[PDB]
Design a protein around this ligand. Structure first.
Ligand code: HEM
Length: 468
């Protein structure tokens, strides 16, 4: 019972129940819980995930202090979440100095140059997705976005970490894809995780039995797959394709360095885990918005048609040049910041601009809630891209709008993700128009689970701009 911590500090929040803390209030999902707390408690509030104290903060300066100012010193790590095994070394699960070192070895791998050089590969799959989407529409039936983008997301992943070039969508059974496919984002509200939240003392027991949240079935497979291609393939030299693995392999081969072949395997897997369902979900939200806002869709199409007359293949610089595109992407991320919350564990007693935060408390920034906070957004529930226009985006506080988090521990694949999604969006809109379908849910309703996603999958009628 650390359940008295918050009233002891005079910090408001919902009253916790023995053992459960406040988890039954998650019956409508993390985001609804955070919006309702924001509303009734104010700028700061506390709650308990089992016995774990969580202090939500909403003040921009405090957020910067936590995410930026005091990253290395006090708020360096995310909260532990369950049995992880060797993945304990994935950069996103790694802690303190261990994390700092991994954050160095990997920086170069995510530089624009390395990125630009990966465009041809990803772009190549944009052609594949279009080629693919061409059929699904050409046919007649509504298209289920998660699937088309799931495959596209998959294809970019494999391809950008050694030439495993597969048309994932039409090779549903290619084992290598049938495994990477299983690397889905965790729903921390499913029974298992709720149980570990209420019985955290069970994690060491699962670790000793080698029980891991990532499917060993799949982790084993890729561990071995990387092993061979890391040898078998390029252990022949002469001709390499600037993918993450190679960047990880070569980074290996000539301060703190030397990525353990196991670490490297951990990185490759986490990069997949970090980008697979995230990219696909964001693309789907965007397409939903464009379909329910024809005018925006058209305008986007006109800009694309302008920067690339007559379906001209997208390019790094060409992508960067499109502003309405950038505005549409950003607006969608404001409405659907898929991480939902940003978190940091307080490694030690501290005071940040006024309030004292005890050691061990989890400091949480409710992105979903700050993104829809009336106090900062006119008609928060509305999809209005102008919000991010050139002469308007300056009024946006970066500690309020945080779809990719902020500070030293922000999303390391952010630019890659933005690039990936735009290239895809360009290719697709540069060929089709998505319109609401009779089965299209409007307004879109969000799941009540622990992931930010539509209640029912988004399906839309897809039409080719002059397809005969
Ligand atoms: C639209 C897609 C994506 C979104 C919205 C997104 C979101 C985020 C967010 C909000 C964080 C937490 C930041 C923080 O705590 O301050 C994060 C972490 C991170 N992201 Fe992404 N991400 C996306 C895709 C990617 C992709 C494609 C990759 C990999 C190439 C990637 C790699 C990671 C990693 C490794 C971390 C952990 C970084 C660290 O702790 O040092 N993400 N992401």
């Amino acid at each position: 019972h650390s359940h008295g911590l918050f009233k002891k500090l005079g910090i408001p929040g919902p009253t916790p129940l023995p053992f459960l803390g406040n988890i039954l209030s998650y019956h409508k999902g993390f985001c609804m819980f955070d919006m309702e707390c924001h509303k009734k408690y104010g700028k700061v509030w506390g709650f308990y995930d089992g016995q774990q104290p969580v202090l939500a903060i909403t003040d921009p300066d405090m957020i910067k202090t936590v995410l930026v100012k005091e990253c290395y010193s006090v708020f360096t790590n995310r909260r532990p979440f369950g049995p992880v095994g060797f993945m304990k070394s994935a950069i996103s699960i790694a802690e303190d100095e261990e994390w700092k070192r991994l954050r160095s070895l990997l920086s170069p791998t995510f530089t624009s140059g390395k990125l630009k050089e990966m465009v041809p590969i990803i772009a190549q799959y944009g052609d594949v997705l279009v080629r693919n989407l061409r059929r699904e529409a050409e046919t007649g039936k509504p298209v289920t976005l998660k699937d088309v983008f799931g495959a596209y997301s998959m294809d970019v992943i494999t391809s950008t970490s050694f030439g495993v070039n597969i048309d994932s969508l039409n090779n549903p059974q290619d084992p290598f894809v049938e495994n990477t496919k299983k690397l889905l984002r965790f729903d921390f509200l499913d029974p298992f995780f709720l149980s570990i939240t209420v019985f955290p003392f069970l994690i060491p027991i699962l670790e000793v039995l080698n029980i891991c949240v990532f499917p060993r079935e799949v982790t084993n497979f890729l561990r071995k797959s990387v092993k061979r291609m890391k040898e078998s393939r390029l252990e022949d030299t002469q001709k390499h394709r600037v993918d993450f693995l190679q960047l990880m392999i070569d980074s290996q081969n000539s301060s703190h360095k030397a990525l353990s072949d196991l670490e490297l395997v951990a990185q490759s897997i986490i990069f997949i885990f970090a980008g697979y369902e995230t990219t696909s979900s964001v693309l789907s939200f965007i397409m939903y918005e464009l379909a329910t806002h024809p005018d925006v869709q058209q305008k986007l199409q006109e800009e694309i048609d302008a920067v690339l007359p007559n379906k001209a293949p997208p390019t790094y610089d060409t992508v960067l040049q499109m502003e309405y595109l950038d505005m549409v992407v950003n607006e969608t991320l404001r409405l659907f910041p898929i991480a939902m919350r940003l978190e940091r564990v307080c490694k030690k007693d501290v005071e940040i601009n006024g309030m004292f935060i005890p050691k061990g408390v989890v400091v949480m920034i409710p992105s979903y809630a700050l993104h829809r906070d009336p106090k900062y957004w006119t008609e928060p529930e509305k999809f209005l891209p102008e919000r991010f226009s050139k002469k308007n985006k300056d009024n946006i506080d970066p500690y309020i709008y945080t779809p990719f988090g902020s500070g030293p521990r922000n999303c390391i694949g952010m630019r890659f993700a933005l690039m990936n999604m735009k290239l895809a969006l360009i290719r697709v809109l540069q060929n089709f128009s998505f319109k609401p379908c009779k089965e299209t849910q409007i307004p879109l309703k969000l799941s009540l689970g622990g992931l930010l996603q539509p209640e029912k999958p988004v399906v839309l009628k897809v039409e080719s701009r002059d397809g005969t």
